[PDB]
Design a protein around this ligand. Structure first.
Ligand SMILES: C[C@H](C[C@@H](C[C@H](C[C@@H](C[C@@H](CCN1CCCC1=O)N1CCCC1=O)N1CCCC1=O)N1CCCC1=O)N1CCCC1=O)N1CCCC1=O
Ligand SMILES: COc1cc(CCNC(=O)c2nc(-c3ccccc3C)[nH]c(=O)c2O)ccc1O
Ligand SMILES: [Mn+2]
Ligand SMILES: [Mn+2]
Length: 183
């Protein structure tokens, strides 16, 4: 029932850096998913992963603590350390980053719908008011809590450009339509 490859899989392996592909594979397998069949979720996990890493690449050297990309047990271990060090409330859901400069966790979101729908979706799940939310879209829009976009405009514009490039590469392969209507 598991195939030897699809068009979305070969594109993902060609589109994203190999370390991004390996971490997304480990993330889905940890949660009982196979990138070879769940190929749309495979591309989304890679995209969310690259956005998280470009995000932390913005700002100072020691500004961010990367939560995404670690295994669930170690990600929660770093979260407990951050909460037990700074005093920030432990979030109910595992976030993506921690901002040592702003003293808050960040939940990064990447949507194929309107940024308005996803942000409201993540906000109603986040509860913990302290967790900052920052949503990106494949169209170039972005939403952040309190209109506080954390990073510089150049770092965010770089992320938006990459998202639209991934969109164009998918569409030229006739893979974008099935990718959008699958979120
Ligand atoms: C630290 C290590 C891996 C890091 C992953 C992350 C990737 C980072 C690499 C940079 C350099 N660039 C930029 C040019 C190409 C490249 O390579 N970027 C950012 C842009 C794309 C990319 O690739 N970073 C950040 C610190 C150094 C590093 O490599 N991760 C994985 C999750 C947690 C984490 O910190 N870790 C930590 C333990 C497991 C592991 O593997
Ligand atoms: C149960 O689903 C998974 C959960 C994990 C744990 C860590 N991932 C997140 O916490 C996370 N997931 C997503 C996400 C959700 C659905 C489709 C694609 C995406 C990209 N969007 C985020 O913003 C985020 O932070 C790993 C793989 C999964 O398949
Ligand atoms: Mn996450
Ligand atoms: Mn996220």
């Amino acid at each position: 029932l598991v195939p030897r490859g699809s068009h979305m899989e070969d594109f993902v392996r060609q589109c994203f850096n190999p370390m991004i592909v390996e971490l997304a594979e480990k993330a889905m397998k940890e949660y009982g998913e196979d990138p070879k069949i769940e190929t749309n979720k495979f591309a989304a996990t890679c995209t969310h992963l690259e956005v998280c890493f470009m995000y932390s690449d913005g700002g100072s050297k020691h500004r961010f603590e990367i939560i995404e990309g670690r295994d669930r047990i170690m990600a929660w271990t770093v979260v407990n350390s951050i909460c037990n060090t700074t005093g920030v409330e432990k979030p109910k859901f595992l976030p993506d980053l921690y901002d040592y400069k702003e003293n808050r966790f960040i939940e990064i979101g990447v949507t194929r719908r309107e940024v308005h729908i996803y942000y409201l979706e993540k906000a109603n799940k986040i509860k913990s008011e302290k967790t900052h939310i920052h949503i990106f879209s494949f169209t170039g829009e972005e939403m952040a809590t309190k209109a506080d976009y954390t990073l510089d405009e150049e770092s965010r514009a770089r992320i938006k450009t990459r998202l639209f490039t991934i969109r164009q590469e998918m569409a030229s392969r006739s893979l974008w339509d099935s990718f959008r209507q699958s979120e």
